[PDB]
Design a protein around this ligand. Sequence first.
Ligand SMILES: Nc1ccc(S(=O)(=O)Nc2nccs2)cc1
Ligand SMILES: [Ca+2]
Lengths: 212, 218
Amino acid sequence: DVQLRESGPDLVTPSQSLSLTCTVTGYSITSGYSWHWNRQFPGNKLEWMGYIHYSGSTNYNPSLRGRISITRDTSKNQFFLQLNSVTTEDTATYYCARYGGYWGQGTSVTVASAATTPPSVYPLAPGGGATNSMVTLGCLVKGYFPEPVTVTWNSGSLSGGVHTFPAVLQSDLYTLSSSVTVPSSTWPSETVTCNVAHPASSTKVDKKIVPR
Amino acid sequence: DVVMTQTPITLSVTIGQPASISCKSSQSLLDSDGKTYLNWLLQRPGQSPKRLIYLVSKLDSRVPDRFTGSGAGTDFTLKISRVEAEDLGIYYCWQGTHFPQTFGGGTKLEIKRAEAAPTVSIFPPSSEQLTSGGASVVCFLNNFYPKDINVKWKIDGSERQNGVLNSETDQDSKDSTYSMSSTLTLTKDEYERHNTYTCEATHKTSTSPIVKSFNRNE
Ligand SMILES: Nc1ccc(S(=O)(=O)Nc2nccs2)cc1
Ligand SMILES: [Ca+2]
């Protein structure tokens, strides 16, 4: 019942090294197979980076100079990636993997010199009126870094009619939006609040969506 | 590296219909040990790659037999007898015969469904934002199909090309629609010089642009 679990930093500065850990369970990394690091770039293309063999030898893609090493801790059943001199081109989702169709959940890594920055949170309330039985409200979350942010609505009791859009770059920081659609019978007569969490900056913001 | 080229690049298929995807290698995938190390994988939105087929035509035991692989040498094919909703995602080929192992660039399968008109909403900048010196006008275009849509902004009757950022969701797993947000960002002083802001969507579900608007005067 083989499982693979990657962990390590969200954000690395250019030129520095990136180190990740893959924690393997349900199979001993000394008992067989090669144990691989792969990565997926924005745009979905996949590259194999290297492996550590059960004997402990290593083989690396020519495309990663000698700036990649893989090591292991056979006592904890973990193997490790280290990629040095990183650049914007190494920004990616990193996956540990084994033959037989086993992949980790993946871990996303951005490489930037931009600083961790907490979000502003703006409410989206409609202008001066329409008849209809449903209303759409939203939140605009702007100028935070790095990914991710979470958005919930009224602490998650509103999940049904929600769309939270992928973040886009905007002046070297991220901006996302989310919309929620509720019965006009319930807003504005009841409160709708967007809850925004930005873990990198240790921030939670609640914004109430008020009419006009 | 051995180049792996997949065709087509995107494909739209109705649930219950078949599909086919081809993978071509820059040289033969036969290894000196006599086996041909070619696999097919699926990656569903926001998940890891999963193995479908290995050694050209062997079915992974976790995968249903609606998936089959064939081919030899440099030419390979994945077929899906009958497409299900769960087959939404990106398919990749992979070779592990030559060093370094390589992956093809991926083929995106979307589920074809009935045309659906977007629900379009427009929002004025908040006063909060205006205190930062910036202004963002937000337009939501929710639960539509097909994906192709053109969104145009006008200010007092004229098209505003710049300052617009769009974000699209991946295809929805429950209803197979797409949604999009479009944001027009201006400076506050520019925002405060004009009265009429409009988001116009061109989409095959209407013979005219779908329009939402507001006037700064109120
Ligand atoms: N690095 C790596 C590349 C592909 C795969 S697989 O999921 O296709 N399973 C495979 N099984 C046999 C060969 S590949 C696993 C790890
Ligand atoms: Ca070989």
